[PDB]
Structures are given as C-alpha cells and as structure tokens.
C-alpha cells in the first residue's frame, strides 16, 4: 500500500498511465492564497505560480513572457484542471444553496403538518361545543313546553 507526494509535472500524469494507481491532489484556494487541505481523489494538482505571482503584484509582461517559455501541453493541463475544479466549485456552491432550500422545505412541511393537526383538533372541539350548546337549548325548550 503506497501513498506518495510530488510537485513534478511528469508525476501529475503518473497514475493515469498505470493499472492499480490513483492520482490525487490537495486543494489550494488562489483567491485567499491559502490551502483548503481538501484531498481530491482522481483530480491531479494544477500549478498556479503565475496566478499567485499576479495576485502578489508581478507585472503582466513578465508573466506573459514566462508563459511563452512553457510547452503547449503544460498550458492545456493546468487550464483543464482549473475548468474541472471550477465546475466542481459550481456543483458544491449550487448544492449548498440546494441544501438550504431543502432544509426550509422540510421545516415548512413540519409546520404545515403541525397546523393541520391543530386545525382538526380545533374543529372537533368547536363541533363538540356546538353539539353540547344545541343539546342544552333543546333540553331548555322541552322543559318550557312541558311547563
């Protein structure tokens, strides 16, 4: 049983070429410049050096030149991971909204069930009070007719 770690653009691809091997990564949030420490099984780790450098103030002409020293395959891989990761972020955010709506719907359903029980109980009580009052009045009228 092997768990290994790497930062090499060769081993970004290592496990997909192999039977019985998994490639993974641990997620980084560029927007906070902080690791989320979240293990993504099946998703390999993009490099973000230029995006971090830009967020730290490195000039766009230096980043543009450095990106021209890279191979065409490098620039595709980290962009595809960013598109996957953004699609996953969208799924997670839209799910968090969906969980909020589901909790509100479940609460509203419990409130409606409780109101239906209270309504039936109030109705039965008012019918019983009305039947008692009718029976007392008929009994009073029968007594007056007897008199």
């Amino acid at each position: 049983r092997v768990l290994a770690t790497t930062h090499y653009p060769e081993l970004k691809a290592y496990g997909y070429n192999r039977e019985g091997v998994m490639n993974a990564s641990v997620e980084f949030d560029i927007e906070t410049l902080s690791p989320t420490y979240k293990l993504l099984i099946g998703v390999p780790g993009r490099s973000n050096a230029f995006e971090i450098s830009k967020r730290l103030g490195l000039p766009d002409h230096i980043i543009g030149q450095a990106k021209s020293e890279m191979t065409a395959e490098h620039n595709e891989v980290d962009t595809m991971i960013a598109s996957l990761e953004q699609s996953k972020k969208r799924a997670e955010e839209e799910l968090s909204e969906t969980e909020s709506i589901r909790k509100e719907a479940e609460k509203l359903h419990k409130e409606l069930q409780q109101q239906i029980i209270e309504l039936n109980s109030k109705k039965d009580k008012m019918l019983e009070e009305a039947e008692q009052q009718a029976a007392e009045k008929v009994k009073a009228a029968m007594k007056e007719a007897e008199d």
């Binding site: 973000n48 230029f50 730290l56 490195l58 230096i62 030149q65 020293e69």
Partner: protein, 49 residues
C-alpha cells in the same frame, strides 16, 4: 514571500544596482518556476544591474 520580495526588487533596481537571487522560482512546479526565473532575469538584465 520570495515573490513579494522579487516584486519589491523589480520596482527599485537600476544600472547602479547589485542584485543577489537564491533559487529563483523555487517552491512551485519546476517548469513554471524556471519560466518565471528566466523572465525575471531578463527583466533585471535589461537594466544593466
């Protein structure tokens, strides 16, 4: 931290400057690190520092 310091160096360097750089672009993907390092060295080299 290196990148913040490098940005601060790039704002201030001139032909009358010494600049000392240890392992430019370390702590990231080696290809992006090497590409950053070459572009930073070219930027500084043009100042004749």
């Amino acid at each position: 931290s290196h990148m913040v310091n490098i940005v601060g160096i790039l704002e201030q360097v001139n032909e009358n400057s010494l600049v000392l750089f240890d392992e430019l672009g370390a702590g990231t993907d080696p290809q992006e690190g090497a590409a950053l390092a070459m572009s930073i060295l070219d930027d500084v080299h043009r100042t004749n520092a």
